[PDB]
Each structure stands twice: as C-alpha cells, then as structure tokens.
C-alpha cells in the first residue's frame, strides 16, 4: 500500500501572554512519531514512537533546530498577517502549515504537498507540480510574490521528491514492526429496538490498523447507503482504531441485512449478519 | 526528517 510522511505546525497568538503557543507533530501514515511544544520544558523535538528512538544525537539536534526555527517564523507570520488583514492586536489568531510526501506501494514518489492556513482557512498552497502556488486572496498574493521572488518552491520540490521520500523509506524499514504491520478488525454486531416498527443494527470494527477501512450495509445483496450511518473513525489510544456503522431497519427484516467489512488486514471482505 | 533549515516568512 501507499505511505506518507507528514508534518503539522500550529501557532496561536496570545495577546497579553507574550509569545504564541507553537505545537508541531510528525506522522508516518497514521502513526505519530515526534512532537514539539513551545510551552513544554524540554525545548526539544521529542520522540513518540519507539522506532524513531534509535536515531542518534545529530538527528535530534537537527530536528530540534529546524522545529524551533519554524516556531520563530510562525511567530513573525502571525504579526505580518495581522497587519495584512488590519486586525486588532487584542485577538488571538492561528497559523497552520502542513507538508509531506506520499509514496506508492513500490515506495517511489507519488506526490508532495505543502499548504498554509490562516485562522482555519486556506491561505496559500503549492500545487501538485511543485513549481507553482495558489493563493486564496490578496494577502496571500503578497506572500506568493515574496516566495516566488525567493525561489521557495524549488527548495521545497528538491526536498519533497528527494529527502522526504528517502527518510520516509528509512522510517518504514526501521519501524517495519509498527508501520508495516496490519491488525485486522475485530467485528461484532449489536441490536437495539427503536420505533417499534423499527430496530437498529450496528456493525462494529475494533482494534484495527491502518485507519483506512470500509464498512457498508446491504439489503439483500444491495448497497444500502439509505438511512445508514457511519461514525468518524476514532483512535482506541493503543495505536489501533475503531469504527461502526448503523442501519435502521423494519423489525423482523433483520436477516435481510448484512454488514461488509473491507480492510487491508482482511485477505477477504467479511460479511456479518445479526446472529441470535 | 523536516525540510530545513527553515522557511521564509509570509
């Protein structure tokens, strides 16, 4: 399957508190592996997965230095953008940056990305060709003109197509026990009456990795996305995920309904049916 | 591994 390495950087201004709160996290696929918090004691990038712990002193010094440097530009940016939008110094605002790279299941480059948001909205982003920028408004245009003149795009592209994917491949190998595992979903069904012409069937998938998973309900072998209901996939907290889907059905039609579970851990799609 | 050394300001 495909893989990705992604980094997420958030800064929130805090008028009257002085410096903005800066939080950074890195991920491979669905697994977190580093963090930094401007307000924590260490002032270092910190490991959050065991496979990154094996990186030496130089690695950690490097990552720590880059992430701190990143917090400083985010802090400048919050002032600059405040000005661009003529906003009061009394309010708290947010800058977000995300970047990363994907690889195919051959582990060659598929795509790279780099995007930026101001107060939770798209601000500027590198297009897929990694040579050009899309800007959401005229503030963002001003940034685009600076970054074009600075040739930021070429630096990014050399990174995303080279370094990013090389280090991603390295993490997948070193962490292969964590990152190249699949944990197949454990599944079961619940039954609850409702309405009294109707009952709710809920199909459960627990303890699976990766997060990617497809649950559907069928009525007599027929795709049933019609008052069916899917919760957002949710982390169990132990590195696995959880999800369910629900269908509300006329009572005594229970047997007509089947739940279909697709997941990379499953050599074959599971079918479930209300049992007792 | 992060992009570096750093980014330009917006």
């Amino acid at each position, epitope marked *: 399957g495909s893989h990705s390495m992604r980094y997420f950087f958030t800064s929130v201004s805090r008028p009257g508190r002085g410096e903005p709160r800066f939080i950074a996290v890195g991920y491979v696929d669905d697994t977190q592996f580093v963090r930094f918090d401007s307000d924590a004691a260490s002032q270092r990038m910190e490991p959050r997965a065991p496979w990154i712990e094996q990186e030496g002193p130089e690695y950690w010094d490097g990552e720590t230095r880059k992430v701190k440097a990143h917090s400083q530009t985010h802090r400048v940016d919050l002032g600059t953008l405040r000005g661009y939008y003529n906003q009061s110094e009394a309010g708290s605002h947010t800058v977000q940056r995300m970047y990363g790279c994907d690889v195919g299941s051959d582990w060659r480059f598929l795509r790279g990305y780099h995007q930026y948001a101001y107060d939770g909205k798209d601000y500027i982003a590198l297009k897929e060709d990694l040579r050009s920028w899309t800007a959401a408004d005229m503030a963002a245009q001003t940034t685009k003109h600076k970054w074009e003149a600075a040739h930021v795009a070429e630096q990014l592209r050399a990174y995303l197509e080279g370094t990013c994917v090389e280090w991603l491949r390295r993490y997948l190998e070193n962490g292969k026990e964590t990152l190249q595992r699949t944990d197949a979903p454990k599944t079961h069904m619940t039954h609850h009456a409702v309405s009294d012409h109707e009952a709710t069937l809920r199909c459960w998938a627990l303890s699976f990795y990766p997060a990617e998973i497809t649950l559907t309900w069928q009525r007599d072998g027929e795709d049933q996305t019609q008052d069916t209901e899917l919760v957002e996939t949710r982390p169990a907290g132990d590195g696995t995920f959880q999800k369910w889907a629900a269908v509300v059905v006329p009572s005594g039609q229970e047997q007509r309904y089947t739940c279909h579970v697709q997941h990379e851990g499953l050599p074959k799609p599971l079918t479930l049916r209300w049992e007792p | 591994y992060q992009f570096g*050394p750093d980014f330009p300001i917006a």
Partner: T-cell receptor
Amino acid sequence: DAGVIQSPRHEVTEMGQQVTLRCKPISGHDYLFWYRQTMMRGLELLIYFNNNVPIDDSGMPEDRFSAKMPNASFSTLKIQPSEPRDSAVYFCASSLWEKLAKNIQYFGAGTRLSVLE
Amino acid sequence: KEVEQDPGPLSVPEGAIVSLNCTYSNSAFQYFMWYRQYSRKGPELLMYTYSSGNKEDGRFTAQVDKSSKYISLFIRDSQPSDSATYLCAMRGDSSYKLIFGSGTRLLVRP
C-alpha cells in the same frame, strides 16, 4: 553599500579581562552569524541567530563565551575571562532567507583581537 | 564534519590554470561553496553548488563529486589579483552553519 558594522575594529588586551565584540547587522536583515578565524583552526562558526534567537551554537566554546542579541539591530559576543588562545579575527555577518538560499551572507570588516599574557 | 584542504602555498605564473580542492567525510553535506579571502580581509563568495556536478562563471569552474566526496575549483588564465587564500565551505539542510576547509594560499606571479 553601508554594511555590517563591527566594533571595535582592533583590540589589544591583557588576559583575564572581559572582552566585548559588537555587531550591528544590515538593516532589515534577520539572521546574524558570528565566526572566528585563527592560524591554528582556520575559519569557524561560533553561533547564529534568527529573529534574535540563537539557532545553532554548537560551535561556541564550552564556557568563557557567551553571545546575545537583545534586539534586531544589536548582537554582542563576550569572552570572560579572556585568554591568549582567544586571539583571532572575529567576523560578524548578516543575511536574509532568500540570500541564504543562494549561500550569500554579508560580512562586517572584523574585529582583530589580541589577548596577551 | 571535517574537511581537509591542502594549505599550499601555490605559486603559479600568470596565465596558468589553477586547481583547488577539498575532501570531506560527511555524506550529509549538500551545499558546497568557494570563497576568496585577501589578506587582512573578510571572505568573498565566488561560487556555490547544490549537490550536483559542475558550473562555470567566467574563468571559474566549480565541481562537486558526492561519491568521492571531493570538490574543486578551477581558475582559468590566472591573474596576479587572484592572489589570495581560497577556502571551501559546506553544510547540510538542517542548519546554516558552514564548515570550512583550512584554506589554500595562491600566489599568481606577474
């Protein structure tokens, strides 16, 4: 044309005293670098700052050397107590991201420091 | 992060091609530069290369071979005013910190 200003241009001093080297970066520049150069070690980075904060100080001597940037226009480097082996030319430089991407920085004229026994 | 460079000094006659080089051991270096320093002055950037081979500016050619970890600068048609110390420097992508060679003194004889 009017570049990085360093002070003093020359210093001849006795070991045991505090030495202060000063630099004002080019106006608008937001990186500042301190290097030293001797006969014995060649040319070496001591520290650099960005937005007034120290980013890399791996080249700082382990104890008599301290560098500060109180505001965007002023950096000092202090040696206390000074020793004859500190004798060197100290250069300060400043730059901007877009110049550093092409590996350009701008150097002051240096401070020539002799620390004598 | 050690870069080795021969001090020379080199003495060549005006019009000669000069060859300067450094070797290094850290495979993480990716940016390679040459500076000229006239005596009792600061260094002046001449040429810069990202990983990536060879480039030419006027009488100068800079080259990088990342497998042999060997970089060079060639100066065509050397002139007396090229007399100076020549220093290579390099870094990675994690810090703007430059690691320099010890320098090579060049005298071009008029």
